[PDB]
Amino acid sequence: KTPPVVFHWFPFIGSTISYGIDPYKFFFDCRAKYGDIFTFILLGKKTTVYLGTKGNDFILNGKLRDVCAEEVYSPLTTPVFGRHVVYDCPNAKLMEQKKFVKYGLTSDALRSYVPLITDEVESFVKNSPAFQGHKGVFDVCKTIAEITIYTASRSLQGKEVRSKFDSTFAELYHNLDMGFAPINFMLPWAPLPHNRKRDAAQRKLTETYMEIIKARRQAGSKKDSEDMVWNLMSCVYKNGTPVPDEEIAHMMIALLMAGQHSSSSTASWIVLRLATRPDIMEELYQEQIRVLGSDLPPLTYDNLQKLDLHAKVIKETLRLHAPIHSIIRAVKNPMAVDGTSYVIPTSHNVLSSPGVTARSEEHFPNPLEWNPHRWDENIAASAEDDEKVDYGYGLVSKGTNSPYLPFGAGRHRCIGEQFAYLQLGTITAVLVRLFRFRNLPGVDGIPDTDYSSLFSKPLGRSFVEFEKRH
Ligand code: HEM
Ligand SMILES: O=C(N[C@@H](Cn1ccnc1)c1ccc(Cl)cc1Cl)c1ccc(-c2nnc(-c3ccccc3)o2)cc1
Question: What CATH class has 15-468?
Fold first, then answer.
């Protein structure tokens, strides 16, 4: 039926289970049965998978009013972030909003962020119950969720938001995060208790961001450089309107969720991998000394650059683990194929999977092997000998043909990528200073992945040993 249809027992439910349990195996099988294009049903909608590098190009460089993102996302996201931002607007508005955020993340801000993030990771160690003592075990995901949330908030969100995380400002985010409950895939409007709580969180949070904002202006200052003093002025659209406190409030919320979903997961995988690879961790420690100096002086915007393998660790973890597995778009007008029989209908979605190409023998030898050293030919923030475009938030890669595209591509491309690197880099390096990790029992491996919520993370409550260095 048009592009072939995956074989499913059930209506509506269709293939929904096989995707949910694992999207990658589900995808590798469908490649083996129908090649690079199949169509499956996910919760009562026909979703077309165009795999492969050309497949990534199709959707992410799709033209604006053939594929539409904000129509797939808005009913889940808008209750969560707040109205009038991100998906709550026509693309044109999302481009401007990105530009504000990108403007906020200039190298001068990143620099300013580095000491703050080290400060937050050093204090957490000194002060949290998690690493008390010379040797012990810790719950990686919970510990790491705390560290990432503290560091991001301190730098990006600012002092108030940060200190608010000592007051129960985290009941809220926890409660807000319920809006990403899988059920909410179709039921986001329905007022089950979790949905009601999220609306409670959303109200309170938004108020709180606004009190912060107004109170600053109530004194007419600047301090130094988070996204928000940033947005406070770093906010005028083409039309010439300053961004309202409410849109500032909701972007801050959206950014918070984005980092948290993304960086927490990755950093946890970073921790677990090292835990299985004491050779690597000790290779990193030794790299610090060599490039870094035996003194081991503090980290800076400048030094982290020199940490070549540290960066390769993050890169290679991202290769196997990038949380996002599936980028979905609403097909609006029938799309003609590259030299093939097929027409892609309206009332189809399309789904690209960056990770598949990145786990492929065709692009990567021995793909399932987690080996940083495979980048002993290459290092970048994701970089390309390929095209670039300004969709309204500055020149960025169209040149998005790489098999490795973990930050996406095209007009929706991630703009957190440097900050992610800034942070994950800063976090892992510190942890490399202070610790050796190793696997818990004498029974070892790497835990499975919970793909089930739309973003991937480690499935387990996974503890790992730790031993300090002094
Ligand atoms: C490993 C960490 C991260 C990964 C893997 C990641 C991945 C991605 C991906 C794949 C997209 C495009 C998905 C799509 O097409 O809808 C994206 C978009 C985006 N990411 Fe990230 N991201 C990361 C970190 C961050 C951080 C820290 C922020 C913010 C601080 C951020 C903010 C965004 C934003 C604003 C978009 C815009 C999407 C759009 O315009 O439609 N990301 N990210
Ligand atoms: O997690 C989601 N979005 C994140 C992704 N992210 C993280 C870092 N970079 C990108 C996100 C992106 C941008 C911003 Cl500003 C904030 C965040 Cl938190 C996400 C987004 C949308 C959905 C979603 N909305 N509708 C669906 C849907 C509906 C029906 C069927 C299948 C999916 O999924 C799920 C997760």
Answer: mainly alpha
